[PDB]
């Protein structure tokens, strides 16, 4: 049995918008520490990791532990029906193939109930080791989204180059090439500098999280996946992982 109420349902809505153009089915891990989701996309080339800590739900009760197999697509059409100012409660009989979703509102006048079936889902979890990356780049999440859109008109892979006082972005295609250089304000923290290439198609799904945070942080190291993180204030985060190109 799990029940969880959220005063800022605003967020769930956006979480699901993030997750939804990337993966269609996933598995929600529910515990008393909170709500966790790990999923790769269908190519096993990116992966998304979601955490919504119990201490952030304006009401939390996980009774026993619980893995809910969910069509994110379905779920996305449901959270789209939530008003933006709506209080979103979740609830799940401690098994039965069905998760429940309540949208209360401002002046307690309208109340929306949706029940979505769920799914025996045999999905595959990876263990990501604890580590720290050579380069940690912090930038305004907006600035990063438009960067990936811009360069994505030029080419389809981006070359990210980290250095003491700045980071660079480069692409090239049958049109020419282009290069975007940002430099310490946009923050860097770096042991050894880095240079990898990543596929914009996936980056450009990641920035769909952009409304969750005003900042985004990428982490890198030689010949290992990029980490793209968004801090969901007071509450947890969305990491995307992307394997480097080549």
């Amino acid at each position: 049995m799990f029940e969880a109420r959220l005063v800022q349902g605003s967020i769930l809505k956006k979480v699901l918008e993030a997750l939804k153009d990337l993966i269609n089915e996933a598995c929600w891990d529910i515990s008393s520490s909170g709500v966790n989701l790990q999923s790769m996309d269908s190519s096993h080339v990116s992966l998304v990791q979601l955490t919504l800590r119990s201490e952030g739900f304006d009401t939390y009760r996980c009774d026993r532990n619980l893995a809910m197999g969910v069509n994110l697509t379905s779920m996305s059409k449901i959270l789209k029906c939530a008003g933006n100012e709506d209080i979103i409660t979740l609830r799940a009989e401690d098994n039965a193939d069905t998760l429940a979703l309540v949208f209360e509102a401002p002046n307690q006048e309208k109340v929306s109930d949706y029940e979505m079936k769920l799914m025996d889902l045999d999905v595959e979890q990876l263990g990501i080791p604890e580590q720290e990356y050579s380069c940690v780049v912090k930038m305004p999440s907006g600035e990063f989204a438009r960067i990936c859109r811009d360069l994505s008109h030029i080419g389809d892979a981006v070359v990210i180059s980290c250095a003491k006082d700045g980071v660079k972005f480069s692409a090239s295609g049958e049109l020419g090439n282009g290069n975007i250089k940002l430099s310490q304000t946009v923050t860097i923290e770096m042991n050894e500098p880095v240079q990898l290439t990543f596929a914009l198609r996936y980056l450009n799904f990641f920035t769909k999280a952009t409304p969750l945070s005003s900042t985004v942080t990428l982490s890198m190291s030689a010949d290992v996946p990029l980490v793209v993180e968004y801090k969901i204030a007071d509450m947890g985060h969305l990491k995307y992982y992307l394997a480097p190109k080549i």
Binding site: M40, S43, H44, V45, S46, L47, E124, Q125, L126, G127, I128, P129, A157, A199, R201, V224, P225, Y241, A243, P244, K245, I246
Partner: peptide, 20 residues
Amino acid sequence: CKRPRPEGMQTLESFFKPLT
């Protein structure tokens, strides 16, 4: 048939071994 995979990358499984 060759299972479709975007050109030029590895699975994450080659980087993060799956739980078991």
